[PDB]
Amino acid sequence: LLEQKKYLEDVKLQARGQLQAAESRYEAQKRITQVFELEILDLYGRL
Amino acid sequence: LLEQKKYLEDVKLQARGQLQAAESRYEAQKRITQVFELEILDLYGRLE
Amino acid sequence: LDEYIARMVQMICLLCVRTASSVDIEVSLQVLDAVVCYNCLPAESLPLFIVTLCRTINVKELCEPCWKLMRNLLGTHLGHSAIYNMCHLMEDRAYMEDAPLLRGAVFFVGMALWGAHRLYSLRNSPTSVLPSFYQAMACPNEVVSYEIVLSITRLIKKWDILLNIIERLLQQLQTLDSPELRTIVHDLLTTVEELCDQNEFHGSQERYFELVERCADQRPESSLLNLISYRAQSIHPAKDGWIQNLQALMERFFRSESRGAVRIKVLDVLSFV
Amino acid sequence: GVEEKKSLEILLKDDRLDTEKLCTFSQRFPLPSMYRALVWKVLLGILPPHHESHAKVMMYRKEQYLDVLHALKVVRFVSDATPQAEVYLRMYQLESGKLPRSPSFPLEPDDEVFLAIAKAMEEMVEDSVDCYWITRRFVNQLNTKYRDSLPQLPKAFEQYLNLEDGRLLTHLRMCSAAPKLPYDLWFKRCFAGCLPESSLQRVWDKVVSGSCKILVFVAVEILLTFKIKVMALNSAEKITKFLENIPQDSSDAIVSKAIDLWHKHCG
């Protein structure tokens, strides 16, 4: 039972980290997305 | 013991749900990036 | 007109290339075609016009052996413009029945792929050009998908997750087209494609769709060691519960299975669990 | 049914928001309109069984909504001079990766069905963010969950109105109007626009909670409620036009009868 309680704490911690990793991935993706949007406006700078 | 088991199960469900929630944002962002580069090359053709 | 030097004190050149177009559809198979592409050659030695026609007429030629002539023409043609690819992909409608056309077009476009970049100068933008290929695969034909698989395999010899997901859908439609036009070549290219995917897997930056593709291609056509890595990654999740997943795999690989080796494998996996 | 409303709110009181309890609640009782949208969000997976988490889900929803709208603005696929159903079309086609190239491209049946649902959905729920999640998930469970029964719906409708009224079925066979009855608007588009929206989500309660063939019964209850107009006609054109120019009087009674109809054939 004590081992099971320790396992529950470990799984909760693992769930927290995976979420943050995915979110950071989304952030990185957002940086290329914003950079891509900018270059679009730059080439709009032609007309 | 059984009680702790069911506690674990519910917590797992909750976590996975709220995770795939943001995974939707992930998918959507990738789609936005895709169509972006598409129109990027499109106007590249339209450029000269 | 082979006497012609690149000087243009004239204007009707657009009409003469219209004529070259009208006539090249039926010419000699090895000489007068050479002459008409030869007269097309100095066109790039001059400013030009709307030449979507030049696309649709310099495309149904790559089949017959003239590779180097068309290659030179189109390579040096890719200057002063890039919109070539745009109309190329605009040629992905009402054309599902134009195997040679799409064949030549996409094979030439493969220049934009990792195989050989004789231009090396234009905006790469491969993720953009990809789904056009998924479209072009709207009709199942051997040689077109053949050049497609050859071009994509060359490209993948190397990042952009979107690149991946798209070509994932590409090979998905591929495996969808396999059970019908069961040639005895694309089986190879496909399975060896899975293999080389499993090799650059270490730096693939890809997703796990790959593994589930094996589940779709679970037909023993796929190699055995493929299945080994497969079951490994597929049990990798099962750690505390999700028993239904475990037993589903068990069915797929203990009841429905022939090669006893992987049976031993799944069995010892269960034992470990 | 105010006691039913209190049983609903006590089903919603626990931070463990089961769906099958709500599923039974729906299958036996139409829902309070004010709380309809809400349960649909949890009915349609938009919200987990734990309300306290819905806070973050809302942020994810508002974000994937602002993002797609801003993108469509950037590419100029959508113009601010468009409707609510039409503005969502760019987001769907995009989210589904099948966004076309020409903003003036012709449309496809799914587009019109999706466009109709969005117009009906907008009337059903004032919140645009809630409507996008609802229409998405609804069209989804249509094309991926209940598409198993959607093609073979007219034959089932004939079978089910058959043993309850063969008179309005026998004449149809003579009429040569059977193979041309387009229940799509009432089955695929699910009454979106023809019947009054403000009084339509009653059946859509069980629908979003998982009632597929129930529209069949509602179709039955459009041949019972308007038997004379269909009978006063024969040719498939007059029949289908009357089905189009159906009055907007008593959709209430139609759905109330279809309740007992769906109870009679199914349970």
Output b/e per residue, D16-35; b: 16+ Cβ within 10 A.
ebebeebbebbbebbbbeee
Smallest Cα–Cα separation from D154: which of D240, D255, D246, D254? D240
Expressed in Å, this structure's resolution amounts to 4.4
Is C83–B45 a contact, with Cβ atoms under 8 angstroms apart? Answer: yes
Q: From the list B14, B21, B28, which residue is nearest D68 (CB)? A: B28
Does residue B26 sit at the A interface (CB-CB below 8 Å)? yes
List all residues of chain B from 8 to 37 with a beta carbon under 8 Å from chain D. Answer: 10, 13-14, 17-18, 21-22, 24-25, 27-29, 31-32, 34-36
Chain D residue numbers touching B13 (CB-CB < 8 A): 48-49
Task: Tell me the C-alpha distance between D69 and D12, whole Å.
Answer: 32
Is D56–B21 a contact, with Cβ atoms under 8 angstroms apart? Answer: yes
Q: Is C113 exposed, middle or buried (0-12, 13-18, 19+ CB in 10 A)?
A: buried
Residue C60, SS3 per DSSP: coil
Alpha carbon dihedral B36, B40, B43, B48, in 10-degree steps, equals 170
Does residue B38 sit at the A interface (CB-CB below 8 Å)? no
Does residue C241 sit at the A interface (CB-CB below 8 Å)? no
* In contact, D65 and D74? CB cutoff 8 Å: no
Sign of the C-alpha dihedral computed for residues C247, C249, C255 and C261 taken in this order: negative
Task: Tell me the C-alpha distance between D26 and D100, whole Å.
Answer: 38
Task: Give chain C's length.
Answer: 273
Task: Tell me the C-alpha distance between C233 and C240, whole Å.
Answer: 16
Residue D37, SS3 per DSSP: helix
Helices and strands of chain D, counted as H and E runs = 15, 0
* In contact, C129 and C169? CB cutoff 8 Å: no
Does residue A13 sit at the B interface (CB-CB below 8 Å)? no
Beta bridge mates, D123: none
Return the residue in B20, B29, B31 with the most chain D beta carbons within 10 A, the one to mutate for interface testing.
B31
Task: Tell me the C-alpha distance between C242 and C250, whole Å.
Answer: 13
Q: Is C6 exposed, middle or buried (0-12, 13-18, 19+ CB in 10 A)?
A: exposed
Does residue A22 sit at the C interface (CB-CB below 8 Å)? no
Helix%, strand%, coil% for chain A, nearest 5: 90, 0, 10
Smallest Cα–Cα separation from D178: which of D231, D229, D236? D236
Is B41–C129 a contact, with Cβ atoms under 8 angstroms apart? Answer: yes
Does residue C240 sit at the A interface (CB-CB below 8 Å)? yes
User: DSSP label at C252?
Assistant: I
Does residue A12 sit at the B interface (CB-CB below 8 Å)? yes
Which chains, if any, share at least 3 CB pairs under 8 A with chain C? Answer: A, B
Long-range (24+ apart) CB contacts under 8 A made by C26-30 are C29/C64
The whole-angstrom distance between B13's CA and the closest CA on chain A is 11
User: Experimental technique used?
Assistant: cryo-EM
Long-range (24+ apart) CB contacts under 8 A made by D150-158 are D150/D187, D150/D188, D150/D212, D153/D183, D153/D187, D153/D213, D153/D215, D153/D216, D154/D181, D154/D183, D154/D187, D156/D213, D156/D216, D157/D183, D157/D216, D157/D219, D157/D220
> In the numeric block, which tokens belong to residue D214?
């129930």
Task: Tell me the C-alpha distance between C223 and C228, whole Å.
Answer: 9
Return the residue in B6, B27, B33 with the most chain A beta carbons within 10 A, the one to mutate for interface testing.
B33
Does residue A8 sit at the C interface (CB-CB below 8 Å)? no
Smallest Cα–Cα separation from C231: which of C195, C267, C190? C267
Return the residue in B3, B13, B36, B47 with the most chain A beta carbons within 10 A, the one to mutate for interface testing.
B36
- What would you report as the CA-atom Rg of chain B, rounded to the nearest whole angstrom? 21
Does residue B37 sit at the A interface (CB-CB below 8 Å)? yes
